[PDB]
Every structure is written in structure tokens, then in C-alpha cells.
Amino acid sequence: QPIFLNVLEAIEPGVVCAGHDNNQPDSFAALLSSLNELGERQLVHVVKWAKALPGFRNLHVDDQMAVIQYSWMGLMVFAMGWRSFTNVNSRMLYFAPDLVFNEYRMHKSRMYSQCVRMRHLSQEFGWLQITPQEFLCMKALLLFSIIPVDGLKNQKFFDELRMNYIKELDRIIATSCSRRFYQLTKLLDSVQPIARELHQFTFDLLIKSHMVSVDFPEMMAEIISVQVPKILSGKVKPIYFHTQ
Ligand SMILES: C[C@]12CC[C@H]3[C@@H](CCC4=CC(=O)CC[C@@]43C)[C@@H]1CC[C@@H]2O
Ligand SMILES: c1ccc(OCCSc2nc3ccccc3[nH]2)cc1
């Protein structure tokens, strides 16, 4: 019975620091390069985490890289909102212990409205009173929530895995159980429009980066110019539970 949860809680990654120098005055270039660095850092964890998920290693290996590459934004954002919820009560954006966005940093990052949506996301955990177990299952399901419209190499395996994760979440929930399931499914869905705003933003930023003194690490640069445009151009689409 508690085997699946045991794994989720066991493999949950720990604190990742951004490397940000809070002594330097908040500037758009500084704030954004630190996010990029954080992103690159958190990426390593996401890989090791994902490969340690129950059933994940039996996806086709190409599909293993692909789904990680399409879903990191949504994963990292959903986690951050959780950190923000548990650490600063959704009042600020707790990207890392060494990189917390107050109101001022939200403005300086030129990402204000996105940050507002992300804060809203964070406030939801409070609103819905999400248990940590619910959070871990939802976060794992997020990794199977976005795919090419033309299918993966072994779609069959993907579909079975995804179904198992959905039934895992149901179990963790269980009128009361019906309403509840609807809520987390709508909450999970709400992650995708936010991920997309961030995909749009980071892509525009990459294009004009040499122009605005904002550095991108190798893996971020690679992914944002090869994988993210597939999402933007509509070759990769998220899987929503409810019709938008
Ligand atoms: C993509 C990004 C750098 C990586 C950030 C991302 C915002 C969302 C986010 C939350 C995290 O906790 C990890 C870093 C990431 C993934 C940043 C938005 C603009 C910047 O380029
Ligand atoms: C191929 C496809 C999926 C696979 O597992 C998906 C993990 S879901 C799951 N939840 C469980 C809960 C209890 C016991 C076993 C469980 N398996 C394994 C091989």
C-alpha cells in the first residue's frame, strides 16, 4: 500500500541554490542570469529524480529525454510554488534560499505578470489545503503531462505509465473524493498556461540575450532553442484533463 509513496518521498530532491550574489544590487541582467543558472542546476536534479521514478526506465530511452525536455518548466514551477507556499506563505517567490523574489525583484526581472500568476499558483496550495503526498503525486504526473502531437516512439508505454500515475493520485485522495479529484485535476491543468507564458518569455529572452547582458548556460541554451520552439510552434502540446 505505501510502497509508491515511499519512493516518491525518498527520491524528492533537496535544496538547490541559485548561486546568486544578493550583495550585488538587483538588476534585470543579474536576476535573470541567476534564474538561468538555477534552471541549469535544478535540471540535473530533475533528470536523476525522473529516472528514479517507478516505471520511468521502461519508457523508450529517447522518450525519456524528450519528456524531461518538454516538461521541466512546469515541474520546476509547480515545485517552486510549493517551496513558496511552505517557506514564505506564498507571499514571495522562493526560487531558492539565495534567490527570493520580493515585490521589487518581480518588477526588476521584467517578469511581473508571470510572477503574479506563479504567486497565484502558490496560493492555491493553501486554498486547496494540498497534502505533501498529494503534491508529490501531482508533481510526478506533471512529467507525463506534455507530448508531441505526433506521438513518442513508444506511445503505448507512455499511456500505460501515465494511467498508472493518475490512478496513484486517485488512491492518494481516497462526493468528497469526487470533488477533490476534480480540484487537483483543474489545479494541474492551470500549470500549463503558466508554463507556456514562461516558455514564451524565456525564448524571447534567449533571442535578445547578447543584447541585454543575460547569460544562458549550455543546457538551457540548447533546450530553449531546440525543444521549447516545438512547444511554441505547436508541435508539442500539453495534455489537459479538462477541456479549456
Ligand atoms: C527560464 C528562466 C530561467 C529558469 C527559471 C525560469 C522561471 C521559472 C523557474 C523556476 C525555478 O525554480 C527554476 C528556474 C526556472 C525554471 C526562468 C524564467 C526566465 C528564465 O530564462
Ligand atoms: C511498466 C510500466 C509501468 C510500471 O509501473 C508504473 C508505476 S505505478 C505503481 N504504483 C504502485 C503501487 C503499489 C505497487 C506497485 C505499483 N506500481 C512498471 C512497468
From Swiss-Prot:
Phenotype when changing residue 72 to L: Strongly decreased transcription activation in the presence of androgen
Domain topic, free-text comment: Composed of three domains: a modulating N-terminal domain, a DNA-binding domain and a C-terminal ligand-binding domain. In the presence of bound steroid the ligand-binding domain interacts with the N-terminal modulating domain, and thereby activates AR transcription factor activity. Agonist binding is required for dimerization and binding to target DNA. The transcription factor activity of the complex formed by ligand-activated AR and DNA is modulated by interactions with coactivator and corepressor proteins.
Effect of residue 79 to T: In prostate cancer
Family affiliation: Belongs to the nuclear hormone receptor family. NR3 subfamily.
Consequence of changing residue 122 to P: In prostate cancer and AIS
Phenotype for residue 52 to T: In prostate cancer; somatic mutation
Region of interest: Interaction with CCAR1: 1-243
Entry keyword annotation includes Hydrolase: no
Consequence of changing residue 235 to R: In prostate cancer
Impact when changing residue 89 to T: In PAIS; 50% reduction in transactivation
Keywords of the record: Activator, Cytoplasm, Disease variant, DNA-binding, Isopeptide bond, Lipid-binding, Lipoprotein, Metal-binding, Neurodegeneration, Nucleus, Palmitate, Phosphoprotein, Pseudohermaphroditism, Receptor, Steroid-binding, Transcription, Transcription regulation, Ubl conjugation, Zinc, Zinc-finger
Originating organism: Homo sapiens
Domain NR LBD: 1-224
Residues of the full protein shown: 671 to 920 of 920
Annotated site (Interaction with coactivator FXXLF and FXXFY motifs): 222
Name under which the protein is recorded: Androgen receptor
